Design a protein around this ligand. Sequence first.
Ligand SMILES: OC[C@H]1O[C@@H](O[C@H]2[C@H](O)[C@@H](O)[C@H](O[C@H]3[C@H](O)[C@@H](O)[C@H](O[C@H]4[C@H](O)[C@H](O)[C@H](O)O[C@@H]4CO)O[C@@H]3CO)O[C@@H]2CO)[C@H](O)[C@@H](O)[C@@H]1O
Ligand SMILES: [Ca+2]
Ligand SMILES: [Cl-]
Ligand SMILES: [Zn+2]
Length: 509
Amino acid sequence: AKVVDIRIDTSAERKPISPYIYGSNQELDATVTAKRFGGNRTTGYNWENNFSNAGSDWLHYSDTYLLEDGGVPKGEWSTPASVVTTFHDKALSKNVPYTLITLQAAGYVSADGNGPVSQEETAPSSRWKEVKFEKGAPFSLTPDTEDDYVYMDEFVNYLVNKYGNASTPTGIKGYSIDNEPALWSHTHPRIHPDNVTAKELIEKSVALSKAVKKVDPYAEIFGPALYGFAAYETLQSAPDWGTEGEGYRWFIDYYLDKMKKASDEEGKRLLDVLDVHWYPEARGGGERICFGADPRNIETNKARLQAPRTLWDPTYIEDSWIGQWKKDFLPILPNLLDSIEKYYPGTKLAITEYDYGGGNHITGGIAQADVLGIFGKYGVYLATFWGDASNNYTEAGINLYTNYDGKGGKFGDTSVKCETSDIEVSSAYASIVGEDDSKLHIILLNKNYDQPTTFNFSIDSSKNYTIGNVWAFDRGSSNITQRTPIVNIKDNTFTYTVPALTACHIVLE
Ligand SMILES: OC[C@H]1O[C@@H](O[C@H]2[C@H](O)[C@@H](O)[C@H](O[C@H]3[C@H](O)[C@@H](O)[C@H](O[C@H]4[C@H](O)[C@H](O)[C@H](O)O[C@@H]4CO)O[C@@H]3CO)O[C@@H]2CO)[C@H](O)[C@@H](O)[C@@H]1O
Ligand SMILES: [Ca+2]
Ligand SMILES: [Cl-]
Ligand SMILES: [Zn+2]
């Protein structure tokens, strides 16, 4: 019999959980709290006519993909920014409080939707329009599609004119400085053939941020949307890192320090959120836990359940090149947060793309629930899962926090102290609402693969809990269903046995 003790103190370690950590990039069968318009297709997106380029994802085709995939009504295809206004309109209609829109910085955007762009048509060419951050002339709500430029501040002006600025209820709250710059030369060689330099990225980030904030001083700027660890460390061996990086432990520090320096010179914050993508490299059963992972491989599923620990646990070393060669930078969230504290205090942290895999398997659901608990506990500001609606268990993991009862019930927004005696077989996160502990929320995850786990709970609270309602998902179904309530609570202690591989949300009152 596996027995684990869970100890919670509702008065200790109280910290707000940002409401935006429960987001997505795609349209999911889950209640989300943030929507990001980003990814490869957004680098060459032209707001003036809605065309965009697939880059290496599909023969460098310039077409109407984003209009089609975004579900934009045909009659609006020629309307400026219809891809983005359709995107934000949808978010607003779903009561999503945060919309993050990627702006273009690689350099050029699609001039047309005429198909493949040849290598001989690498920008500049008739197939592209040059991006300029500041128009330097009066904005127009009807941008000229005949000239050679596309202006980012004019794009932002169009959105602010329509929705109000970021301080208002319907305004777009954040903008991203493009997408995965260290991969521009790989994903978008027809736009930016040369490997991005550290100097170039800072120059562009500062210039675009200034341009955006002159239009909407309340908008939050997100950067650099790094694809993965190699970019975090050296911006993918940036051509000038040997010189620019002198004295810096990794590119993350250089980016924060240089953005802080530019902000100090400008007189206002130019970087609001340090933004990175994290697709785990963790392996099990001979394969990575994401990207083509086989749900039949038990060792991979088991590795997926432990992988979230790389985000916070100093004692956990995953099986990957990062776990092997980059221990100095693990656990990853504390290292990113440490860098922020050292080089640009006050900067927020966001994970704008991530996927732990096994999306249609119970372990993908449990890992997703674990990751969200970790994001909340460690102070992540915004997070957006990258993956489609077929990831039913990932969606259950999100709904366990955002809509566990099907009627809007959600995890508390204030994290409180909650410790488990066995971090390998379980995870537990607790929260309350605001400053009130009248209702105590607990996400309890049993990672035991084939045996139930008995949990002995001990809670320190100003309230005496008498009932604990329960909602959970498991291998029987990704649908979250209400379970029999916990009723024998003695002096805020109780014992609850959970079946193998089950994710629960307990609400004590
Ligand atoms: O070209 C016409 C053709 O399009 C087909 O659909 C394509 C689309 O053109 C293409 O742009 C799209 O690309 C995806 C890509 O497949 C996906 O891997 C990638 O994911 C990246 C992400 O962008 C991140 O920034 C980072 O690198 O991590 C993630 C990976 O986890 O995003 C791209 C889009 O941004 O794929 C679709 C489907 O193949 C139509 O299907 C076809 O009918 C049209 O004729
Ligand atoms: Ca133009
Ligand atoms: Cl990158
Ligand atoms: Zn789904």
